[PDB]
Design a protein around this ligand. Structure first.
Ligand SMILES: CC(=O)N[C@@H]1[C@@H](O[C@H](C)C(=O)O)[C@H](O[C@@H]2O[C@H](CO)[C@@H](O)[C@H](O)[C@H]2NC(C)=O)[C@@H](CO)O[C@@H]1O
Length: 616
């Protein structure tokens, strides 16, 4: 099969002109479009003849879709069908960032609790079924490529840039879950891309040249960052997406910035040493290498979008993502100029022509392997739409989402059997969180439990604390409550701490993200109120609540708006609090102590049984 796949791809590439070949290596977006006569772009939700004409002219290898383009199942199937009608010779790779959790694009699909939640749920089977469900939805929609999984390792709490998009701080847990997410997508014939190579998880905090910098030496990079990429590559990864990050330990090449004329270190995307020497040769990856988005401001500014395409191709990449930003026919020639720059590089010998042929063969082999080519589907658009409506966001998928999110909830403290809350009729629950959307999600979850007669009728009060200070009016609310649920949101956990003592005296609204919830905790404890803290994003804030009797993490923070839950994590937490779910989560990261700096407060793998109060 793979043998036959390669001969086939070779015959196809041998017949293509250079224009057709360079076309395959481009993957633009058409997020917004401004038609002739229009004064401004608007979201592209349906095909028009202007966009179709550029797809026909330049013969792109693919299109990346964004949320603007995929708002409903009906519109999306119509759009992917019309994109493919405009690309009949070689079907397009139609791609998307459908990661789950905090990065999703589908307007009507299943969101999932995200990677760190999968880390917390631990099982490779859960990651596989998640990738499998995402893959089923994408496939029904006519989307055939997913830029997932993230296999970046979030191992530095002091710079958690990938954060909940990462499975874990541990290389093996990240590797395992990445591998099975990828197998799950591929099982549904979705091309999967590992990202972001060679590892975006731990960049230098004081990066100050616009491109993130990783200062670690090769031994550490080979032992940690590269490890889940290697495992997945050997298990048959289709694609790898680059990181626009400097790695001096592998390439110290500089270029003269077009932004300020200074010498700038090359990012991994434009490094032959990383793309060819390390990924292609040393790690033996022969699948498709795709750049991270070339419109990222620092690439465009330091290198120029057009010249970056040429440099990335020279470095050994196969697909340039978003190689030019074209939003109307007035700027179509941006595409012609990109092609022309690649032609000049081939003509003058900067890029050997055989390198181009080899890259397009990788692309065509992948399209064949994942059943993108040849296309022999005889269903009408209407028929595909009806099929997709049964699959996308189906209640079966939503049930899986719910059970995964509930499974991932991690109980860090439950002293004195504080949880579950079992309120008597007439209890007042005070619900406190940074935003109205978050308090609404908690409120709506409790309301549903009441209508479902799972808990007795209770009164609810909400307290939204972003930018606020806890004062006498808030303490009054705490005193009047019978149960308190508080949500905490941090990226980096940054309380003011002195010699291991957290500062509670900050009374002017500054530092609210840590000061306010702690103040609610202190009042509740002072007034003997059942109090639970729910960590909403990065779980490092658990370290701020050692005095609390009940503490959980849900690893996702988006709330409820326009009758819709934006993420399932918060409802999963509330369900656990009221004894209607079985949390089984264990930490996928270490949580550093703030009161004893340098010590781990809660280690990787820690999590309690909510019933027995004992560790899992
Ligand atoms: C709001 C927005 O779109 N910002 C983008 C970046 O995307 C963010 C990070 C996002 O939506 O997740 C964009 O980042 C890259 O975009 C690629 C394609 O959408 C992603 O596949 C990729 O994962 C993402 N890179 C990272 C490290 O997250 C960025 C270019 O890097 O340009 C805008 O800022």
């Amino acid at each position: 099969s793979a043998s036959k796949r390669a001969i086939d791809a070779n015959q196809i590439v041998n017949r293509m002109s250079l224009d057709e070949k360079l076309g395959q290596m481009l993957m633009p977006d058409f997020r917004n479009w401004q038609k002739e006569g229009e004064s401004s772009p608007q979201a592209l939700t349906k095909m028009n003849d202007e966009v179709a004409s550029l797809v026909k002219k330049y013969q792109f290898g693919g299109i990346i879709l964004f949320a603007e383009n995929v708002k409903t199942t009906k519109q999306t199937v119509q759009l992917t069908d019309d994109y493919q009608k405009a690309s009949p010779k070689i079907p397009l790779m139609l791609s998307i960032d459908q990661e789950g959790g905090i990065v999703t694009r589908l307007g009507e699909g299943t969101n999932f609790p995200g990677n760190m939640a999968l880390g917390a749920a631990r099982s490779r089977i859960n990651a596989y079924q998640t990738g499998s469900i995402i893959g089923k939805e994408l496939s029904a929609l006519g989307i055939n490529t997913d830029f997932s999984p993230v296999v970046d390792i979030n191992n530095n709490p002091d710079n958690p840039v990938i954060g909940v998009r990462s499975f874990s701080s541990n290389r093996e847990l990240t590797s395992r879950l990445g591998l099975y997410t990828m197998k799950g997508l591929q099982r549904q014939d979705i091309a999967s891309a590992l990202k972001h190579f060679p590892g975006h998880g731990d960049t230098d905090v004081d990066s100050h040249y616009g491109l993130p910098l990783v200062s670690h030496g090769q031994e550490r990079l080979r032992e940690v960052e590269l490890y889940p990429f290697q495992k997945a590559i050997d298990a048959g990864a289709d694609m790898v997406m680059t990181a626009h990050v400097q790695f001096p330990a592998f390439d110290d090449t500089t270029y003269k910035s077009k932004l300020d004329g200074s010498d700038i270190l090359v990012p991994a995307t434009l490094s032959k040493k990383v793309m060819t020497g390390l990924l292609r040769q040393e790690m033996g990856f022969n699948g498709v290498i795709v750049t991270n988005a070339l419109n990222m401001k620092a690439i465009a500014d330091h290198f120029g979008q057009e010249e970056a395409v040429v440099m990335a191709v020279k470095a050994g990449v196969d697909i340039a993502l978003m190689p030019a930003s074209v939003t109307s026919l007035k700027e179509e020639q941006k595409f012609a100029r990109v092609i022309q720059a690649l032609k000049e590089a081939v003509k003058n010998g900067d890029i050997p022509e055989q390198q181009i042929n080899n890259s397009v063969e990788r692309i065509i082999s992948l399209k064949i392997k994942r059943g993108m080519y040849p296309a022999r589907n005889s269903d009408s658009t209407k028929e595909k739409i009806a099929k997709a409506k049964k699959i996308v966001g189906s209640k079966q998928h939503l049930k899986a989402e719910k059970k995964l999110a509930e499974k991932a909830v991690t109980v860090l403290k439950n002293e004195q059997h504080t949880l579950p809350f079992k309120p008597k009729k007439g209890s007042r629950i005070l619900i406190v969180a940074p935003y109205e959307e978050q308090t609404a999600s908690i409120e709506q979850t409790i309301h549903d439990l009441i209508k479902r007669k799972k808990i007795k009728p209770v009164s609810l009060s909400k307290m939204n604390f972003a930018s606020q200070v806890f004062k006498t009016e808030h303490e009054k609310q705490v005193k009047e409550a019978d149960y308190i649920i508080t949500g905490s949101y941090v990226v980096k956990n940054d309380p003011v701490v002195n010699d291991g003592v957290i500062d509670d005296t900050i009374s002017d609204s500054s530092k609210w993200a840590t000061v306010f919830p702690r103040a609610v905790m202190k009042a509740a404890l002072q007034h003997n109120k059942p109090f639970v803290l729910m960590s909403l994003r990065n779980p490092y804030d658990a370290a701020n609540f050692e005095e609390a009797k009940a503490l959980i993490a849900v690893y996702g923070f988006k709330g409820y708006a326009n009758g819709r839950y934006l993420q399932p994590n918060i409802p999963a937490g509330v369900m656990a609090i009221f004894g209607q779910a079985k949390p089984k989560g264990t930490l996928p990261v270490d949580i550093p102590s703030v009161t004893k700096p340098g010590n781990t407060l809660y280690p990787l793998g820690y999590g309690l049984n909510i019933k027995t109060g004992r560790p899992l």
